[PDB]
Design a protein around this ligand. Structure first.
Ligand SMILES: Cn1c(CCC(=O)Nc2ccc3ccn(CC[C@H](CO)n4cnc(C(N)=O)c4)c3c2)nc2ccccc21
Ligand SMILES: [Zn+2]
Length: 349
């Protein structure tokens, strides 16, 4: 069955939304936290969506389940270990996984997230434990894995710590900074704390992506490219509403991190219309296909491949092309990136 039975690369999935029902049930059982249920069965149904909803309804599900992992070392490392596992099972041979370290912390972070009480699990420590689990997981399951730390739109006060974290754990497994959250917050791309993190990212050679043009305007994409200097875009769909920016980004070979099934469920893409990625396939744009939050969207990577193959007539050699384009726009050392590409061009023959 699976739409594209071949090796894959994925650049855009978030750890905190790539968590198995059963491990959430586990941890908060053992924690006293509790949940809108206690089978890892009915759990999936309530956290998963089948339908667009508002942002509030979206965020409150991080509020049921986050409190179960966040704070608990064991649970941080574990979720990252078995993240890699999921990807092995998608046939992925390289994945960049992203998250905010503050959002799993319980100590040395204000405000403290998720109505947690203060503990002594700090963000820097978060990174450490994530690292271990992905690294150990790379070892056990045969998928090359790096990670990306997210600043969050609404709290520019955390972004200098993000970049510093990026520089300290640099490719142990951190390779890039990201900007995630509510991208409609008025002027958020230009908050000095964000701007100055991304400038220090240029100064110290840390790679840069930015979620933009998902649910914001094409002015948000422009700000990500021109001011934050990003190298790739998260989603970027609304780029198409500004033609000269579109055309320049095609000429510059900008990579767009597309998340198709994501884009139905979040409202990004409105189903009476054109999918965005269809335009990009016809224009030979540099983009990849990605899942974002499989937990929440009920999905695996094959989901997004089936959607494009079935609803959009994507073909095998288009799936090949974009995975090559994903590996080319990855944030690895150039030596490792060529090694990637060799693996894949071998598999595709
Ligand atoms: C508008 N909209 C967005 C756009 C993205 C958005 O606003 N996200 C957002 C906003 C504020 C917060 C505050 C915390 N988070 C979660 C952070 C974590 C960090 O790794 N995370 C995990 N997944 C996402 C994501 N898909 O946006 C972000 C936020 C995430 N996501 C939606 C999903 C269902 C329905 C509507 C949606
Ligand atoms: Zn995302």
């Amino acid at each position: 069955t699976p739409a594209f039975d071949k090796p894959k690369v994925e650049l855009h999935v978030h750890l905190d939304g790539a968590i198995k029902p059963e491990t959430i049930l586990y941890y908060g059982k053992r924690r006293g936290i509790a949940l809108p249920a206690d089978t890892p069965e009915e759990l999936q149904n309530i956290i998963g969506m089948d339908k667009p909803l508002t942002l509030p309804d979206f965020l409150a599900k991080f509020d049921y389940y986050m409190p179960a992992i966040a704070g608990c070392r064991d649970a941080i490392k574990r979720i990252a270990y078995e993240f890699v596992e999921m990807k092995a099972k998608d046939g992925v041979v390289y994945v960049e996984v992203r998250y905010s370290p503050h959002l799993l912390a319980n100590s040395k972070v204000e405000p403290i997230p998720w109505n947690q009480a203060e503990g002594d699990l700090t963000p820097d420590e978060v990174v450490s434990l994530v690292n271990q689990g992905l690294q150990e997981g790379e070892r056990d399951f045969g998928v090359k894995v790096r990670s990306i730390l997210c600043c969050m739109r609404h709290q520019p006060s955390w972004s200098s710590e993000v970049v510093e974290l990026c520089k300290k754990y640099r490719e142990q497994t951190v390779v890039a900074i990201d900007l995630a959250g509510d991208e409609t917050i008025e002027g958020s791309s230009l908050f000095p704390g964000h701007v100055q993190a991304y400038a220090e990212a240029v100064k110290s050679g840390v790679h840069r992506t930015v979620h933009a043009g998902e649910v914001g305007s094409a002015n948000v994409v422009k700000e990500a490219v021109d001011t934050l200097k990003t190298e790739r875009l998260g989603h970027g769909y609304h780029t198409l509403e500004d033609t000269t920016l579109y055309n320049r980004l095609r000429q510059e070979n900008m990579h767009f991190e597309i998340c198709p099934w994501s884009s139905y469920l979040t409202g990004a893409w409105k189903p009476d219309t054109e999918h965005a990625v269809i335009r990009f396939k016809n224009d030979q744009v540099n983009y990849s296909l990605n899942t974002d939050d499989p937990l929440i969207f009920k999905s695996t990577l094959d989901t997004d491949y089936q959607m494009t193959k079935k609803d959009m007539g994507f073909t095998e050699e288009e799936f090949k092309r974009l995975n090559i384009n994903a590996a080319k726009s990855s944030f690895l050392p150039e030596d490792e990136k060529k090694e990637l590409l060799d693996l894949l061009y071998k598999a595709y023959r």
